[PDB]
Design a protein around this ligand. Sequence first.
Ligand SMILES: CC(=O)N[C@@H]1[C@@H](O)[C@@H](O)[C@@H](CO)O[C@@H]1O
Ligand SMILES: CC(=O)N[C@@H]1[C@@H](O)[C@@H](O)[C@@H](CO)O[C@H]1O
Ligand SMILES: [Ca+2]
Ligand SMILES: [Ca+2]
Ligand SMILES: [Ca+2]
Ligand SMILES: [Ca+2]
Ligand SMILES: [Ca+2]
Ligand SMILES: [Ca+2]
Lengths: 140, 140
Amino acid sequence: NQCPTDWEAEGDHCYRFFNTLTTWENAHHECVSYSCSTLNVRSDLVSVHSAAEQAYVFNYWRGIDSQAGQLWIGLYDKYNEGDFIWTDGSKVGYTKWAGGQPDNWNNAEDYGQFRHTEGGAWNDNSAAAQAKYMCKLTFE
Amino acid sequence: NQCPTDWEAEGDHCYRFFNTLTTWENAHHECVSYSCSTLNVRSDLVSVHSAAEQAYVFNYWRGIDSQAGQLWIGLYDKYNEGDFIWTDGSKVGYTKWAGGQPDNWNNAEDYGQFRHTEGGAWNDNSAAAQAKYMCKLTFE
Ligand SMILES: CC(=O)N[C@@H]1[C@@H](O)[C@@H](O)[C@@H](CO)O[C@@H]1O
Ligand SMILES: CC(=O)N[C@@H]1[C@@H](O)[C@@H](O)[C@@H](CO)O[C@H]1O
Ligand SMILES: [Ca+2]
Ligand SMILES: [Ca+2]
Ligand SMILES: [Ca+2]
Ligand SMILES: [Ca+2]
Ligand SMILES: [Ca+2]
Ligand SMILES: [Ca+2]
């Protein structure tokens, strides 16, 4: 494959899991920092556009990490409450919200993440929460 | 594949043909300019390590370009006359010099290039000469 070292190939993308508990905001900033303008490579929190991509991302994550917990993804509704969008600017199609989610619990949940159960069913969580994270390269 | 837009994939690498006449020196700089330090991607003039890579590069070039002329590659003997090496630090195994080449013509030819004939058989040319050029990404 043609992925940078320490990134994994799948389809037209590269992915990299970071086994560090941090905030969504910091995970987002970390992923974006790998970007490279000279090749128009965007690095960003992972966006998910199919069941296949969901399964790949989840299976990659849980192949390395077996702790109970969550995995930040690039979905958020910070700018317009209830309207979830991807940080990489790609259009939302596929969704996999867990039962009862999203719920904007305590009016402070704007940041998307996989649960470790139900094949990575999604939850919205707060700016104070911690989770692991996953970056994705997009060749723009 | 996982190559950047406007680059082509083959094996563990990406390649990109630039259909513009320029000097070897400028071609070298142009190719290195596509490097991405955050992803440990080194871009350089193409190095050629087998008959397969030779044919891939030649056929890629000649898929686009109909003109008689040459294609700069990363081979040079600028720093040690008569010992051609790759700018990307990979070792010279495979060679495909044209008959009568290299000849260090007028004591001034230190830069490698494919001819548009004989499957891209190589010639050494001067710092004043012009050719098209091909870059290559190496994921270090
Ligand atoms: C393009 C090409 O192969 N050019 C060469 C050149 O480098 C020099 O070797 C010369 C010797 O008469 O013959 C050819 O012109
Ligand atoms: C990790 C996770 O899913 N946490 C949620 C949380 O965001 C909140 O929605 C809550 C509402 O009771 O329930 C949980 O299941
Ligand atoms: Ca909000
Ligand atoms: Ca919200
Ligand atoms: Ca929630
Ligand atoms: Ca010389
Ligand atoms: Ca020479
Ligand atoms: Ca020559």
